[PDB]
């Protein structure tokens, strides 16, 4: 908890994952898969 | 030295007697230049 980032994208394609709320899970690896497929070509669709 | 330098510039001048010919200009659809009209080529990019 030390840096808050506002990635301003004018419009983007989203995709939401659905979790059972009784499951403890750091979902940083879910976003780190999104952060790996970014190149100057394009962006993978945004995960929630 | 002046006789050998001047003959080196006569090969420098004669080897640059070409015609700058244009080629294809694919627009940069990537986001480094964003829609700019660069010239794609080997790999001189």
Coordinates of C-alpha atoms in Angstrom, one line a residue:
Chain A
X1 CA 0.0 0.0 0.0
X2 CA 2.2 2.8 -1.3
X3 CA 1.2 3.8 -4.8
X4 CA -2.2 4.4 -6.4
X5 CA -2.2 4.5 -10.2
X6 CA -4.9 6.0 -12.4
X7 CA -4.5 4.4 -15.8
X8 CA -6.6 6.8 -17.9
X9 CA -7.9 4.9 -20.9
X10 CA -10.6 6.7 -22.8
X11 CA -12.5 3.6 -23.6
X12 CA -11.7 -0.1 -23.0
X13 CA -13.0 -3.6 -23.3
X14 CA -13.7 -5.2 -20.0
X15 CA -14.1 -8.7 -18.7
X16 CA -15.2 -9.6 -15.2
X17 CA -14.2 -12.7 -13.3
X18 CA -16.7 -14.0 -10.7
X19 CA -15.6 -15.4 -7.4
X20 CA -17.3 -17.0 -4.5
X21 CA -17.0 -14.6 -1.6
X22 CA -15.9 -17.2 0.9
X23 CA -12.5 -17.7 -0.8
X24 CA -9.4 -15.8 0.4
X25 CA -7.4 -14.9 -2.8
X26 CA -4.9 -12.2 -3.6
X27 CA -6.0 -11.4 -7.2
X28 CA -2.8 -9.6 -8.1
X29 CA -1.8 -12.6 -10.3
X30 CA -5.1 -12.2 -12.2
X31 CA -4.1 -8.6 -13.0
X32 CA -0.5 -9.6 -13.5
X33 CA -1.6 -11.7 -16.4
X34 CA -3.3 -8.6 -17.8
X35 CA -0.1 -6.6 -17.2
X36 CA 2.0 -9.1 -19.2
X37 CA 0.1 -9.1 -22.5
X38 CA 0.4 -5.4 -22.9
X39 CA 2.7 -4.4 -25.8
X40 CA 2.7 -1.2 -28.0
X41 CA 0.4 -3.2 -30.3
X42 CA -2.6 -3.5 -28.1
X43 CA -4.1 -4.1 -24.6
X44 CA -5.7 -7.3 -23.3
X45 CA -9.3 -6.7 -22.0
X46 CA -9.5 -5.3 -18.5
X47 CA -10.0 -7.8 -15.7
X48 CA -12.2 -7.3 -12.6
Chain B
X1 CA 48.5 13.1 -47.8
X2 CA 46.6 15.7 -49.8
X3 CA 46.8 13.6 -52.9
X4 CA 45.5 10.6 -51.0
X5 CA 42.8 12.4 -49.0
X6 CA 41.4 14.1 -52.2
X7 CA 41.2 10.7 -53.9
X8 CA 39.3 9.4 -50.9
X9 CA 36.8 12.2 -51.2
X10 CA 36.4 11.4 -54.9
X11 CA 35.4 7.9 -54.0
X12 CA 33.2 9.3 -51.2
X13 CA 31.4 11.6 -53.7
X14 CA 31.1 9.0 -56.5
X15 CA 29.7 6.3 -54.1
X16 CA 27.0 8.8 -53.1
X17 CA 25.7 9.4 -56.7
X18 CA 22.4 7.5 -56.2
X19 CA 18.8 8.6 -56.4
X20 CA 16.9 8.7 -53.1
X21 CA 13.9 6.5 -54.1
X22 CA 10.8 6.4 -52.0
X23 CA 9.1 3.2 -50.9
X24 CA 6.0 2.2 -48.9
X25 CA 4.9 4.4 -46.0
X26 CA 2.9 2.2 -43.6
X27 CA 1.2 4.4 -41.0
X28 CA 2.3 3.6 -37.5
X29 CA -0.8 1.9 -36.1
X30 CA 1.1 1.1 -32.9
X31 CA 1.2 3.6 -30.0
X32 CA 4.9 4.7 -30.1
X33 CA 4.2 7.4 -32.7
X34 CA 0.4 6.8 -33.0
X35 CA -0.9 7.1 -36.5
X36 CA 2.3 8.7 -37.8
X37 CA 3.4 8.0 -41.4
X38 CA 6.7 6.2 -40.9
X39 CA 8.5 4.2 -43.6
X40 CA 8.8 0.4 -43.0
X41 CA 11.6 -1.5 -44.7
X42 CA 15.8 -5.7 -43.6
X43 CA 15.5 -4.0 -40.3
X44 CA 16.5 -0.4 -40.5
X45 CA 13.5 0.5 -38.4

